[model samples]
Target: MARPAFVNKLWSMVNDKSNEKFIHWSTSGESIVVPNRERFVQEVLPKYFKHSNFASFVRQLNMYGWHKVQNNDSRWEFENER
Candidate 1:
């Protein structure tokens, strides 16, 4: 199964940001919030999912059990699991 180009692109952007001292300090010290859900879907998700090829790429990952790991601490997890 082929990987989605958008996913690789987004991953690269995130990896680059991870090395920045300000990002590290903001996340670890200042408690700067990170957008975990809506932003990606709003921004990059459509770029890939709208195409059949990209949809297939994501589907392949699902077939292999590549799924969103639940944030056990999030309130939403309980509703979905129970």
Candidate 2:
């Protein structure tokens, strides 16, 4: 899939009930976070995702209009408010 499509697919998982266990309100007051973030940094990530860091990989996605906000050190809440 293309970048936007891939990102949309990722979001769809959170929005869809099938992946409900992984979706949640973020700590430090974010609108939402994902994937048992505990396992995110350590294990599930290495096991599944292609790239590692969220911010680290976003810059590479800029060609698709799906990268970081470039403010507040990167909110990464959503793109074009989704």
Candidate 3:
């Protein structure tokens, strides 16, 4: 199946240089990491999406088949099967 437009847009947004400080791909290129949820929701999200709510953003991630990476750390990370 073709990749969802939302997923494509999300990948582009995350890779954007200006957005790197808020969200970016992990060092392993296996997942996405958001260093600060508050900053990301308040600053980064609305630029691409309609709302600033982090929970809704995470809902989009889950809808797109991205799974949250569980760890002992506080950073928010998500990985996809691809």
- TM-score of every prediction relative to native: 0.30, 0.35, 0.84
Query: In candidate 2, what are the lDDT values of residues 1-82, reduced to their tens digit?
Result: 5556556545554456544455444455435554344444354334336755755444534544543323233223434333
**For candidate 1, what is the TM-score?**
0.30
lDDT (Cα, 0-100) at 17 in candidate 1? 52
lDDT of each: 0.36, 0.46, 0.83
For residue 20, give model 3's deviation from the true position in Å: 0.4
Off by over 4 Å in 2: 1-3, 25-30, 39-82
Clashing pairs in 3: none
Between candidates 1 and 2, name the one with more favorable TM-score: 2
In angstroms, how far off is 8's CA in candidate 3? 2.3
Q: What is the lDDT of candidate 3?
A: 0.83
Which segments of model 1 are wrong by more than 4 Å? 1-35, 51-60, 70-82
Which predicted model would earn the best TM-score? 3
lDDT of 1 by residue, 1-82 (tens): 1656644643443355542321112333322222333343444445445643434544554554444324332111101111
